[PDB]
GROMACS .gro file of C-alpha atoms in nm:
model
  359
    1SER     CA    1  16.053  23.309   4.411
    2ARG     CA    2  16.153  22.984   4.579
    3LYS     CA    3  15.871  22.802   4.400
    4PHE     CA    4  15.992  22.947   4.069
    5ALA     CA    5  16.340  22.806   4.132
    6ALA     CA    6  16.181  22.472   4.224
    7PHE     CA    7  15.993  22.461   3.892
    8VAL     CA    8  16.307  22.571   3.707
    9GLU     CA    9  16.512  22.284   3.850
   10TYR     CA   10  16.239  22.019   3.825
   11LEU     CA   11  16.139  22.104   3.468
   12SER     CA   12  16.504  22.131   3.364
   13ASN     CA   13  16.566  21.778   3.492
   14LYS     CA   14  16.241  21.653   3.336
   15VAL     CA   15  16.332  21.805   2.998
   16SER     CA   16  16.684  21.662   3.016
   17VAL     CA   17  16.543  21.314   3.084
   18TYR     CA   18  16.243  21.329   2.847
   19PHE     CA   19  16.394  21.511   2.547
   20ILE     CA   20  16.475  21.177   2.382
   21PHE     CA   21  16.103  21.131   2.314
   22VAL     CA   22  16.087  21.482   2.167
   23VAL     CA   23  16.383  21.425   1.935
   24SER     CA   24  16.247  21.084   1.831
   25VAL     CA   25  15.903  21.225   1.748
   26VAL     CA   26  16.041  21.526   1.561
   27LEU     CA   27  16.271  21.300   1.358
   28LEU     CA   28  15.971  21.079   1.285
   29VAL     CA   29  15.784  21.387   1.161
   30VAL     CA   30  16.075  21.496   0.939
   31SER     CA   31  16.121  21.138   0.812
   32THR     CA   32  15.759  21.045   0.743
   33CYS     CA   33  15.566  21.367   0.671
   34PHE     CA   34  15.762  21.509   0.376
   35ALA     CA   35  15.833  21.272   0.085
   36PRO     CA   36  15.982  20.931  -0.010
   37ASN     CA   37  16.338  21.053  -0.069
   38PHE     CA   38  16.640  20.829  -0.022
   39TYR     CA   39  16.794  21.053   0.243
   40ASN     CA   40  16.451  21.064   0.408
   41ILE     CA   41  16.436  20.684   0.381
   42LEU     CA   42  16.773  20.658   0.557
   43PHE     CA   43  16.654  20.902   0.824
   44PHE     CA   44  16.357  20.678   0.896
   45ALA     CA   45  16.572  20.363   0.881
   46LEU     CA   46  16.820  20.509   1.131
   47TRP     CA   47  16.534  20.608   1.362
   48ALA     CA   48  16.387  20.258   1.348
   49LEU     CA   49  16.732  20.104   1.399
   50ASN     CA   50  16.783  20.323   1.707
   51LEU     CA   51  16.448  20.211   1.847
   52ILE     CA   52  16.529  19.846   1.772
   53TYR     CA   53  16.869  19.876   1.940
   54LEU     CA   54  16.702  20.035   2.242
   55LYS     CA   55  16.455  19.745   2.252
   56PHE     CA   56  16.745  19.497   2.239
   57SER     CA   57  16.907  19.618   2.562
   58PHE     CA   58  16.899  19.955   2.737
   59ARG     CA   59  17.261  19.895   2.844
   60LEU     CA   60  17.389  19.879   2.486
   61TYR     CA   61  17.166  20.165   2.371
   62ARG     CA   62  17.289  20.386   2.656
   63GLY     CA   63  17.649  20.290   2.583
   64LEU     CA   64  17.616  20.359   2.210
   65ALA     CA   65  17.383  20.660   2.238
   66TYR     CA   66  17.668  20.910   2.208
   67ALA     CA   67  17.816  20.762   1.890
   68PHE     CA   68  17.468  20.724   1.742
   69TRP     CA   69  17.397  21.093   1.806
   70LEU     CA   70  17.727  21.201   1.649
   71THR     CA   71  17.660  20.987   1.341
   72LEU     CA   72  17.305  21.122   1.314
   73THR     CA   73  17.407  21.487   1.342
   74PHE     CA   74  17.701  21.445   1.104
   75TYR     CA   75  17.494  21.274   0.836
   76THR     CA   76  17.203  21.517   0.865
   77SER     CA   77  17.446  21.808   0.838
   78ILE     CA   78  17.607  21.648   0.531
   79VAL     CA   79  17.271  21.592   0.361
   80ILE     CA   80  17.166  21.948   0.446
   81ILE     CA   81  17.480  22.082   0.276
   82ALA     CA   82  17.427  21.856  -0.026
   83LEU     CA   83  17.061  21.954  -0.061
   84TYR     CA   84  17.138  22.325  -0.026
   85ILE     CA   85  17.420  22.318  -0.282
   86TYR     CA   86  17.194  22.123  -0.517
   87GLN     CA   87  16.915  22.383  -0.496
   88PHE     CA   88  17.067  22.604  -0.767
   89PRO     CA   89  17.036  22.659  -1.141
   90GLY     CA   90  17.409  22.671  -1.203
   91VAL     CA   91  17.519  22.408  -0.951
   92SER     CA   92  17.244  22.167  -1.059
   93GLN     CA   93  17.353  22.219  -1.420
   94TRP     CA   94  17.712  22.146  -1.317
   95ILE     CA   95  17.604  21.832  -1.130
   96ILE     CA   96  17.394  21.701  -1.420
   97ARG     CA   97  17.689  21.776  -1.649
   98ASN     CA   98  17.970  21.608  -1.453
   99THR     CA   99  17.812  21.346  -1.224
  100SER     CA  100  17.618  21.202  -1.522
  101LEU     CA  101  17.324  21.111  -1.297
  102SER     CA  102  16.987  21.065  -1.466
  103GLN     CA  103  16.709  21.308  -1.375
  104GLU     CA  104  16.470  21.039  -1.249
  105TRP     CA  105  16.738  20.884  -1.026
  106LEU     CA  106  16.853  21.228  -0.910
  107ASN     CA  107  16.494  21.310  -0.811
  108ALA     CA  108  16.434  20.971  -0.647
  109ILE     CA  109  16.744  20.997  -0.427
  110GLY     CA  110  16.603  21.326  -0.300
  111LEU     CA  111  16.806  21.603  -0.461
  112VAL     CA  112  16.543  21.768  -0.683
  113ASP     CA  113  16.542  22.139  -0.768
  114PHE     CA  114  16.221  22.292  -0.633
  115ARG     CA  115  16.285  22.622  -0.813
  116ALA     CA  116  16.195  22.452  -1.141
  117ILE     CA  117  15.897  22.296  -0.960
  118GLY     CA  118  15.810  22.634  -0.808
  119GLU     CA  119  15.661  22.501  -0.482
  120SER     CA  120  15.828  22.737  -0.237
  121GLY     CA  121  15.657  22.620   0.083
  122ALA     CA  122  15.773  22.264   0.024
  123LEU     CA  123  16.129  22.396   0.001
  124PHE     CA  124  16.078  22.595   0.322
  125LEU     CA  125  15.974  22.274   0.496
  126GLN     CA  126  16.259  22.083   0.324
  127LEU     CA  127  16.506  22.323   0.485
  128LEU     CA  128  16.345  22.404   0.822
  129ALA     CA  129  16.266  22.045   0.925
  130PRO     CA  130  16.620  21.907   0.862
  131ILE     CA  131  16.787  22.201   1.037
  132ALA     CA  132  16.512  22.167   1.299
  133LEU     CA  133  16.638  21.813   1.360
  134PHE     CA  134  16.995  21.946   1.356
  135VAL     CA  135  16.929  22.211   1.622
  136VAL     CA  136  16.731  21.956   1.825
  137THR     CA  137  17.030  21.718   1.813
  138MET     CA  138  17.283  21.987   1.908
  139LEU     CA  139  17.046  22.089   2.189
  140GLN     CA  140  17.049  21.725   2.303
  141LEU     CA  141  17.429  21.708   2.282
  142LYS     CA  142  17.647  21.886   2.540
  143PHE     CA  143  17.329  21.991   2.722
  144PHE     CA  144  17.131  21.688   2.846
  145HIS     CA  145  17.339  21.392   2.728
  146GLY     CA  146  17.531  21.435   3.052
  147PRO     CA  147  17.234  21.479   3.287
  148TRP     CA  148  17.042  21.204   3.105
  149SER     CA  149  17.339  20.969   3.144
  150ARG     CA  150  17.355  21.051   3.515
  151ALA     CA  151  16.981  20.987   3.549
  152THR     CA  152  17.009  20.653   3.366
  153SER     CA  153  17.351  20.559   3.506
  154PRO     CA  154  17.224  20.297   3.756
  155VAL     CA  155  14.905  22.103   4.699
  156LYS     CA  156  15.107  21.853   4.902
  157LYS     CA  157  14.815  21.608   4.894
  158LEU     CA  158  14.783  21.678   4.521
  159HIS     CA  159  15.153  21.600   4.473
  160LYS     CA  160  15.126  21.277   4.673
  161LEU     CA  161  14.819  21.159   4.481
  162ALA     CA  162  14.989  21.250   4.153
  163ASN     CA  163  15.289  21.034   4.244
  164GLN     CA  164  15.063  20.748   4.355
  165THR     CA  165  14.857  20.766   4.035
  166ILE     CA  166  15.172  20.769   3.822
  167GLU     CA  167  15.305  20.464   4.008
  168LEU     CA  168  14.979  20.270   3.971
  169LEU     CA  169  14.948  20.362   3.603
  170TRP     CA  170  15.304  20.247   3.535
  171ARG     CA  171  15.239  19.920   3.720
  172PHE     CA  172  14.925  19.868   3.512
  173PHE     CA  173  15.144  19.935   3.209
  174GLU     CA  174  15.423  19.697   3.314
  175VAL     CA  175  15.163  19.424   3.360
  176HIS     CA  176  14.944  19.474   3.049
  177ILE     CA  177  15.159  19.661   2.795
  178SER     CA  178  15.241  19.338   2.609
  179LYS     CA  179  14.867  19.280   2.572
  180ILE     CA  180  14.813  19.642   2.463
  181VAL     CA  181  15.086  19.630   2.197
  182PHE     CA  182  14.962  19.293   2.070
  183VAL     CA  183  14.612  19.440   2.049
  184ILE     CA  184  14.715  19.746   1.848
  185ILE     CA  185  14.941  19.545   1.616
  186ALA     CA  186  14.666  19.292   1.547
  187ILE     CA  187  14.404  19.562   1.489
  188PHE     CA  188  14.631  19.718   1.227
  189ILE     CA  189  14.718  19.388   1.064
  190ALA     CA  190  14.349  19.295   1.052
  191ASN     CA  191  14.291  19.630   0.881
  192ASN     CA  192  14.553  19.510   0.628
  193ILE     CA  193  14.496  19.149   0.521
  194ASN     CA  194  14.762  19.165   0.246
  195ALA     CA  195  15.031  18.902   0.189
  196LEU     CA  196  15.322  19.114   0.309
  197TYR     CA  197  15.245  19.068   0.680
  198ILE     CA  198  15.206  18.687   0.685
  199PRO     CA  199  15.548  18.649   0.855
  200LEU     CA  200  15.428  18.912   1.102
  201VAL     CA  201  15.112  18.718   1.193
  202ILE     CA  202  15.319  18.401   1.229
  203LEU     CA  203  15.577  18.574   1.448
  204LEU     CA  204  15.316  18.758   1.656
  205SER     CA  205  15.139  18.427   1.716
  206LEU     CA  206  15.472  18.279   1.821
  207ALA     CA  207  15.528  18.572   2.059
  208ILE     CA  208  15.183  18.546   2.218
  209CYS     CA  209  15.203  18.165   2.244
  210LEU     CA  210  15.502  18.183   2.482
  211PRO     CA  211  15.534  18.543   2.606
  212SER     CA  212  15.732  18.671   2.906
  213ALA     CA  213  15.952  18.360   2.906
  214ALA     CA  214  16.262  18.351   2.683
  215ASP     CA  215  16.283  18.730   2.732
  216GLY     CA  216  16.122  18.946   2.462
  217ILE     CA  217  16.319  18.816   2.166
  218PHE     CA  218  16.008  18.755   1.954
  219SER     CA  219  15.923  19.121   2.010
  220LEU     CA  220  16.268  19.206   1.873
  221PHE     CA  221  16.211  19.001   1.557
  222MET     CA  222  15.863  19.143   1.500
  223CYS     CA  223  15.988  19.500   1.548
  224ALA     CA  224  16.267  19.421   1.300
  225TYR     CA  225  16.010  19.287   1.053
  226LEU     CA  226  15.799  19.600   1.098
  227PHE     CA  227  16.108  19.809   1.020
  228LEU     CA  228  16.181  19.593   0.715
  229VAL     CA  229  15.824  19.614   0.581
  230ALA     CA  230  15.814  19.991   0.632
  231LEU     CA  231  16.148  20.024   0.452
  232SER     CA  232  16.019  19.809   0.164
  233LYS     CA  233  15.709  20.027   0.134
  234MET     CA  234  15.938  20.331   0.133
  235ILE     CA  235  16.141  20.185  -0.155
  236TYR     CA  236  15.827  20.096  -0.351
  237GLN     CA  237  15.685  20.446  -0.304
  238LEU     CA  238  16.023  20.572  -0.424
  239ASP     CA  239  16.041  20.613  -0.801
  240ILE     CA  240  16.332  20.383  -0.894
  241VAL     CA  241  16.120  20.067  -0.868
  242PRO     CA  242  15.984  19.961  -1.211
  243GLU     CA  243  15.627  19.880  -1.109
  244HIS     CA  244  14.145  18.678  -1.084
  245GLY     CA  245  14.181  18.997  -1.285
  246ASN     CA  246  14.020  19.222  -1.024
  247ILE     CA  247  14.336  19.223  -0.808
  248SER     CA  248  14.693  19.261  -0.933
  249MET     CA  249  15.029  19.179  -0.775
  250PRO     CA  250  15.108  19.488  -0.560
  251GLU     CA  251  14.777  19.549  -0.381
  252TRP     CA  252  14.738  19.178  -0.306
  253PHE     CA  253  15.097  19.188  -0.179
  254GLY     CA  254  15.023  19.521  -0.008
  255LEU     CA  255  15.349  19.671  -0.139
  256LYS     CA  256  15.161  19.901  -0.375
  257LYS     CA  257  15.250  20.230  -0.545
  258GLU     CA  258  15.053  20.507  -0.377
  259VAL     CA  259  14.941  20.824  -0.554
  260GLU     CA  260  15.228  21.067  -0.598
  261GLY     CA  261  15.218  21.361  -0.359
  262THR     CA  262  15.051  21.160  -0.082
  263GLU     CA  263  15.247  21.181   0.241
  264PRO     CA  264  15.426  20.853   0.329
  265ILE     CA  265  15.296  20.877   0.687
  266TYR     CA  266  14.936  20.828   0.571
  267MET     CA  267  14.960  20.473   0.438
  268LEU     CA  268  15.223  20.379   0.700
  269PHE     CA  269  15.048  20.539   0.999
  270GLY     CA  270  14.971  20.206   1.165
  271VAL     CA  271  15.324  20.076   1.109
  272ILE     CA  272  15.482  20.370   1.290
  273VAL     CA  273  15.212  20.352   1.560
  274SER     CA  274  15.304  19.987   1.619
  275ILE     CA  275  15.674  20.078   1.623
  276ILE     CA  276  15.610  20.350   1.882
  277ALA     CA  277  15.397  20.107   2.084
  278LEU     CA  278  15.680  19.852   2.087
  279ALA     CA  279  15.928  20.121   2.192
  280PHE     CA  280  15.687  20.235   2.465
  281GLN     CA  281  15.656  19.874   2.585
  282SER     CA  282  16.035  19.843   2.599
  283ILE     CA  283  16.087  20.171   2.783
  284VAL     CA  284  15.815  20.078   3.035
  285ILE     CA  285  16.000  19.752   3.100
  286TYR     CA  286  16.333  19.931   3.140
  287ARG     CA  287  16.201  20.214   3.360
  288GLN     CA  288  16.008  19.975   3.583
  289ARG     CA  289  16.320  19.760   3.622
  290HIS     CA  290  16.520  20.073   3.707
  291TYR     CA  291  16.266  20.185   3.968
  292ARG     CA  292  16.243  19.839   4.127
  293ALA     CA  293  16.623  19.819   4.142
  294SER     CA  294  16.640  20.165   4.301
  295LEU     CA  295  16.380  20.059   4.560
  296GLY     CA  296  16.535  19.711   4.581
  297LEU     CA  297  16.228  19.530   4.446
  298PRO     CA  298  16.299  19.197   4.271
  299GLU     CA  299  16.126  19.064   3.959
  300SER     CA  300  15.871  18.877   4.172
  301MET     CA  301  15.687  19.204   4.241
  302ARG     CA  302  15.614  19.247   3.868
  303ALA     CA  303  15.341  18.981   3.883
  304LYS     CA  304  15.113  19.189   4.107
  305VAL     CA  305  14.963  19.531   4.038
  306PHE     CA  306  14.897  19.628   4.401
  307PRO     CA  307  15.175  19.452   4.597
  308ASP     CA  308  15.062  19.608   4.926
  309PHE     CA  309  14.714  19.457   4.879
  310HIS     CA  310  14.631  19.085   4.891
  311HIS     CA  311  14.323  18.937   4.726
  312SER     CA  312  14.189  18.815   5.061
  313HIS     CA  313  14.149  19.178   5.176
  314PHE     CA  314  13.908  19.281   4.899
  315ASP     CA  315  13.598  19.274   5.119
  316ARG     CA  316  13.693  19.562   5.351
  317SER     CA  317  13.597  19.836   5.104
  318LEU     CA  318  13.488  19.889   4.745
  319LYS     CA  319  13.829  20.033   4.652
  320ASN     CA  320  13.989  19.708   4.769
  321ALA     CA  321  13.734  19.523   4.555
  322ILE     CA  322  13.836  19.731   4.251
  323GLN     CA  323  14.204  19.662   4.324
  324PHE     CA  324  14.127  19.290   4.356
  325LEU     CA  325  13.949  19.304   4.020
  326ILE     CA  326  14.235  19.484   3.843
  327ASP     CA  327  14.491  19.249   4.003
  328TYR     CA  328  14.351  18.894   4.012
  329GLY     CA  329  14.007  18.903   3.849
  330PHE     CA  330  14.134  18.701   3.555
  331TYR     CA  331  14.343  18.483   3.788
  332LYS     CA  332  14.014  18.388   3.955
  333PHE     CA  333  13.772  18.383   3.657
  334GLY     CA  334  13.994  18.293   3.362
  335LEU     CA  335  13.774  18.005   3.251
  336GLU     CA  336  13.462  18.222   3.257
  337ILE     CA  337  13.628  18.508   3.069
  338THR     CA  338  13.775  18.280   2.803
  339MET     CA  339  13.433  18.120   2.744
  340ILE     CA  340  13.305  18.477   2.711
  341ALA     CA  341  13.566  18.532   2.440
  342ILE     CA  342  13.464  18.205   2.272
  343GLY     CA  343  13.099  18.308   2.273
  344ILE     CA  344  13.167  18.656   2.136
  345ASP     CA  345  13.387  18.508   1.863
  346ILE     CA  346  13.115  18.257   1.770
  347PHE     CA  347  12.858  18.539   1.760
  348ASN     CA  348  13.099  18.725   1.532
  349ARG     CA  349  13.168  18.434   1.294
  350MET     CA  350  12.887  18.176   1.249
  351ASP     CA  351  13.108  17.948   1.039
  352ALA     CA  352  13.315  17.628   1.028
  353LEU     CA  353  13.591  17.775   1.243
  354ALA     CA  354  13.314  17.888   1.475
  355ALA     CA  355  13.193  17.526   1.466
  356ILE     CA  356  13.529  17.382   1.574
  357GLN     CA  357  13.563  17.656   1.837
  358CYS     CA  358  13.214  17.552   1.950
  359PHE     CA  359  13.334  17.191   1.979
   0.00000   0.00000   0.00000
């Protein structure tokens, strides 16, 4: 009884504070897993813009969250009405008679009559998912937008160990999430050696060359470029666009026309994964700053992973040795580890760049 009330309250608060991730992921699903339609493109663009604005400053994102949610729900309602009223024989005939909009443009923008196509399940998704986003938004508004704003305004042994593990994991994240996001972005962009991401390699190299310092502005520009490249791929997959002999312009430039019917998420999976990784990096930064401010911990504590443990106390037990590793192992053996990286790279290359790296 009392425990049931405890779970009710705790999970209600947790849902109210975590439902932003749920709405973001469901909007990503409805804006990447259906089709390259112009309203879908603007859904995805608004989602990426929201994530970028969050990455800019949590203060501004929190201040403008309410207006963003109203704009999102209003526009998704409007597009739902437009799509529903278009899905008709008579009304579509009236639209093609008066609006004088060509069939290919009218399909590319998104308003295409599936009754002529006959694919009913696609229409069921085309309705459910947008009104799914609508009900999710209205369930965010007037329900948790208050409690979430209040939260962001500034088995007992099992519970204690759970809290400790969460704290240590989030410290590990606040210290190595930049490395993790750089790793995933570079793995993707190595899987795609096209010409369209050359600014992204240049800007990622600039970010890694001088990270931490000068805030995370370079992360902002690279997230913006990821949004721009994903938008460009969306436009190219959309039908309005018109278009040494082994490779042609688009596939060398990476902005190629995929097979029709393929889901846009498939050939932009890595792009959205990198976007989510950048957002996760930003929210880790913001939440760790919030927790350290609530506990009165300055930015100096962010350098260490185990602040209560000093590297001179590693020899008392093996757990202290593991903590010393995780904390300052690189700080002590950076030269050795970087020569390890040099050797592995040379073993992976055997070439002229390997020769200069060998020098």
